[PDB]
C-alpha cells in the first residue's frame, strides 16, 4: 500500500528558508510525478508545485513562484520542497501527494495518496509559556441553575496547548476553544464547564494547563 | 486562473438523506474534475476522479456527475462517516481547489446561554485587561456578538473562536474575547456583549460595572 | 509550448 511521509516542518523566522522532505514507499516513486500541496491553518487546499518523474519539468503556484523549488532523489524515494525567503503566510500544512493513474490518454493532476503533512510555522515569536487566568462564575449567577466558570489561557508560543479540569475527573459540559493568533504572535485560548450553580460552595474547580514547549504545568483554582 | 465554486459552502443534512454538492468551473474543463473528502486534521482523501469514475474501494453510496463547466457529487445516502468538508479539484490546466463545502448534522435551532467575565485582579495587576463572552450550546453557528463600552459599540479589538459540533448533541459554542489596555479599561465603567441569534426572541445582554 | 497537465509519469 502506497505510504507517504513528510518531515521537515517546524517553527522558522520570516526571510529564512527551509527544505522539506516526503519518504515515498508502496510504489514505484520514481515512475510517477509528484506535487505539493499546502493548507494555511482554517483555510483550503492550495496547490504547491509539480515535478515529472524525472525531473524534466517543474510548474509552481504563481504565490510561491522564484521562492520555491521542488526536486527528487529516486535513488532515494524522497521529494523534496525548498522554501527560500519565507513569509507569515507561507505557515500551513505542507502536503505530498502522488499523481493518480488516471485512464488511458487523460489529463493528469488528480491525487490518489496524500502524506499526513508537516506543518511549517513563520512566525518571529519566541517559545513562551502561558498566563492562566480565571473567568470566575457570576455572583448574580441564577438560582438553582447553571453558572459557567474557566480559564483564560493567555499568550503563548508556539501551539499546543492543552486543558483538563480537575484532572481529567470532569469533562461533561466542557468546551475548550481553538486558539486565536494575536496581534503580538502570540496565541490565546479561553476553555470554559457549566456546572450546577448550587455545587458552587461545594465542588472545588481546577483547570490543568499543559504547554510542553515551555515545559510550563499550571493548576488554577477558579472559585467566585 | 480557472476558479473553482462550489456550491453551497456549508450543508447541514441527517442521516439517510440525499446529499448533492455543487462545483462550477469559470471556464470550460472537459471531465478533469476530482473529488475530496477531508476531515479535521487529517489529510484528504479522493473519492472521485475524472468527474464520474469511483476510486477504488469508496463507498458506493459516492457518485458525480457533470462536464464542461457544472459538475455534482452526491451522497445517496449520508452515513455518520460523512460530516466532513467535501472538495473539489479541477486538473485541466494547472491544479485549483473548490473552497470547500462542509457536511454538518442538522439540528433543531438552539439558544445560546450568554455569560460575561470580567477580567481577572491577577490579569489587571500586569497593564491588560481581557473580557470575555461565553455564548454555550447554540445552533445555527451563524451568531452576532457586539461589544459596548459606555454604550461604545467596539470595532476592531475583540477576537472570537467556536467549536466543532458537539459530539453528543450537536450544538456550537463560541468565545469573544475584547482586549484593551489597563488604562483603557479604567477610563469606562460599563461593559456589555449583545448577543443575537435565531433561537432568540430579542438581543440578549449581558454586563457588568468594574465595583 | 509546452501542456502543464500533459502526463508527467513514465511510459
Known sequence: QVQLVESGGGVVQPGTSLRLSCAASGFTFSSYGMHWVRQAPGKGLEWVAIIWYDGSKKYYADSVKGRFTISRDNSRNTLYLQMNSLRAEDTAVYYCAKVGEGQVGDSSGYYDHWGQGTLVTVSSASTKGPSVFPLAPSSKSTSGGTAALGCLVKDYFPEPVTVSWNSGALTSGVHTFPAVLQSSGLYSLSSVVTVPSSSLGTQTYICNVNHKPSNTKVDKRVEP | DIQMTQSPSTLSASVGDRVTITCRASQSISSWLAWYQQKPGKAPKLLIYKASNLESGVPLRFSGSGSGTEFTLTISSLQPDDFATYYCQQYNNYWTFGQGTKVEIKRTVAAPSVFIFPPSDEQLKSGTASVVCLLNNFYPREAKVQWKVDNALQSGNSQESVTEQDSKDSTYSLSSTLTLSKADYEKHKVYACEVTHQGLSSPVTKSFNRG | ?11
Request: charged letters at 0%; hydrophobic letters at 25%; aromatic letters at 0%.
Open chain 3, 1 to 11: 509550448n509546452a501542456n502543464p497537465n500533459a502526463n508527467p509519469n513514465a511510459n
